[PDB]
């Protein structure tokens, strides 16, 4: 019942300023932190040898897009490798991002591991020596981090154990980050896999987020110095019943209003499989939802921002401008969506049953 | 409400058989898993410099004592380095341990780290890639592991968070070990640091263990395939009030009977700074306590089994036989103590009666 | 991290002594705490009007059975009404029970109530004014109480909420009881209904019991001064797979060894609708199970001890002797069962 301040007024201030910059009006996050494992699938999809040079050139392609993306990208999440790579001009990628007004972020988890005794459920590792890594990363240009936990809806999941364990590990990770000046982005992703309907996802999301925030509270986490990266509340991929973006938005916002304390600075949704347009439309619907939303509701997209750019590139250097144009467009479309000003046009423009 | 078997019957049998072998009647554990930075302080206290060879020699000195320790030692806990070292005859240390009827154990935690928002409290790290390490250690002769969490008694400690967190990580560690055929030794140590009395320590111990076993249940841990390494219940190192060995034994067994399920194959106490003699006398009293004890109550001493040995070695090869003799004597004493058959003499020396206390013991 | 003594050494001694006397070697508990509406079905099956008088006579019939039951009965659970009734000779029932070497118990819960948001799960009520009630019952001859929580094995049950809430209310009830010198018997009954097998039941029993003991620890319960009344681990009623009494015994003892601290003074299994014979045979098997059991393993039977006695009685006073002979016989059988010496007429890792 006694307070033992984990952070000083100055440390809190720094964390809060960073979190706010990442989600400033009209800004979102570019999820370009794909590990060498997932980046292999990306490069293969366009027939491109997964070499370090190719990965650099590709990340360089997104990071050096023209100034149009500046007011769109509040932050960029990088994989360890990329954080130390440089642009052709010799500029460290973190410097590239900063000079364009973006905050640098780094993925710090070490993947999921199987939770024994459960039906295929997992937790996430990566806490060992995390404090030293954050201290280094901070010094090397990063101001926020990313840790991903994965939960799945099934006949017996998310189980009590999975919810509790994942919520606890996220708290530990957030705790270590704040001690090192790094704003932690809490990502408790509930996969969309399955044939469950919309209200099933809203139910599970509500229970998961409540556990997450109780856990952050127990570990004395400074909420204003954090961000939330959840799944939007949608029906299962295999769900036979169909819904409208207004329904998805109402369910999403409702689930958040019931669990996410207003102190949390911002919600940066993950696209989790949605098409580039789908992710933008849904995001726009969420911001236009007629309910009180006390936190920024923006994006933290990977493929929803890179899909077209990746294909337009095809690994061919002569397609650089074409590939960047595609990315720029998604950045602009999502910049409008996170403000609710999105339209297929472009720059020119109950709840009791939940 | 639905069982998703973590272990097959065959896996359980292997874990259960391993755990029982380690704490078979009359047998205990030698804790020689001190980290390079910890063992360095030991060798330093005897004018010996911390070098790979010195560390090897000392461990060999302990692991190759005469066949008299065989009945006394059920298992030996080693640090990563020692596990891959060899004896003068070329035999890997794990092989030496087995040839003497002992089970090989390995420490897998990566030390404690501070918990933000608390008053100097910690939790322990070491889960990352633990599964793969356990599979490798298993292949290299290890059958059980050890992980150490440290809690302290103070005005606001252990806190709710500290207790919950430490219990949860121990459970995660235990879960990964059993998935790799390794018996996890759960060590939730409550330091003796402080001036609190016996009942203060009994209360804290009961809360800690209750929390430990609820977490182990939550994580689907096979208790029969585990061992517990708790602190004995004693007053603070700086406590003014005095207690008899019978009182410490009563408080200890009472605390355990109130929190440890009968399924737990055994309890292997840490010496925690108690003198070699004091550690043996209490273990003896514990086993003589007039209460029902559904689990083996033995030792897992680090300091309490090496105080005299180190001093007798002093870092000189010619003192090899002398140092080993001191080790064998402590092991023999403790072998009896865990059977309630230990009766002090007067040959242990002043070394066995010396306090081995170390503030916030880290290793 | 600081202790605030809930009980004094004297209070602990009293509770501990009461707990031990109830489950002393060979002794068990007669569960005769059926309420008016709960006993209605019994009397109906024997065309006996449910009046206070017939209930008094029926209870008198059991409580005054000959001295052969004395070493068999360590305690008798009474319903409020009965605690205040007297035998024909004018002796209050509590006196009768105590004269025969038994301890008097009293049911204190006020029934189960539905837990909203769940698939038909419940919690139990009865905490309101419980302290005042315990002090009064203690003064009126009672030394232990009974409070029943019910859980069911289903598709989504027992859920985390059901488990947590029932564990918590049980702890509150235990806490209040111990403050009034009453030994609380903790009863987290997992119904046998359903088609689940033996493994399903064992798993749920283990999770439920683990939750019960954590709650008890959190509420500072003196375990030595308590008793546990759990369901035996058995397959569901609609289970097609069949098992031997040695198997359910192994599953029962294994579940208990993994969750019940040795400090608990005793385990008094509930009959849970099993037949008089099945309940006895199972308890016997449980006691013969080749595993270490650090607590007494006895009974707390209702119909398992009354079934034949009730039919023999039939509401006819001239049947007094025949009916008592039936109860006495089951009391003798179960006394032998909790000692593993009853006849109908190594650690296994497969659990």
Curated annotation (Swiss-Prot), chain B:
Does the keyword Cell wall biogenesis/degradation feature in the UniProt annotation?
A: no
Tell me which residues bear Phosphoserine: 35, 38, 45, 131, 271
Q: Which UniProt keywords apply?
A: Acetylation, Cytoplasm, Glycolysis, Hydroxylation, Isopeptide bond, Lyase, Phosphoprotein, Schiff base, Ubl conjugation
- List locations, semicolon-separated: Cytoplasm, Myofibril, Sarcomere, I band; Cytoplasm, Myofibril, Sarcomere, M line
Q: Explain what the record says happens when changing residue 303 to A.
A: Reduces activity 400-fold
Enzyme Commission numbers on file: 4.1.2.13
Q: Where is this cross-link: Glycyl lysine isopeptide (Lys-Gly) (interchain with G-Cter in SUMO2)?
A: 41
- Single GO MF descriptor: fructose-bisphosphate aldolase activity
- Binding sites annotated in the UniProt record for beta-D-fructose 1,6-bisphosphate: 42, 271-273, 300, 303
What is one GO cellular-component annotation here? I band
Q: Tell me a GO biological process for this protein.
A: negative regulation of Arp2/3 complex-mediated actin nucleation
Name the Pfam families for this protein: Glycolytic
User: Where does the record place the site Essential for substrate cleavage?
Assistant: 72, 107
Locate the cross-link: Glycyl lysine isopeptide (Lys-Gly) (interchain with G-Cter in SUMO1): 41
Q: Which InterPro entries match?
A: Aldolase_I_AS, Aldolase_TIM, FBA_I
Please describe the post-translational modifications of this protein. Asn-360 in form alpha is deaminated to Asp in form beta.
Site positions for Alkylation inactivates the enzyme:
146, 361
* Residues modified as Deamidated asparagine: 360
CDD domains found in the cross-reference section = FBP_aldolase_I_a
What is the active site of this protein?
187 (proton acceptor), 229 (schiff-base intermediate with dihydroxyacetone-p)
Family from the record: Belongs to the class I fructose-bisphosphate aldolase family.
- State the protein's purpose: Plays a key role in glycolysis and gluconeogenesis. In addition, may also function as scaffolding protein.
Q: Entry's PANTHER family?
A: FRUCTOSE-BISPHOSPHATE ALDOLASE
Name assigned to this protein: Fructose-bisphosphate aldolase A
Q: Which gene encodes it?
A: ALDOA
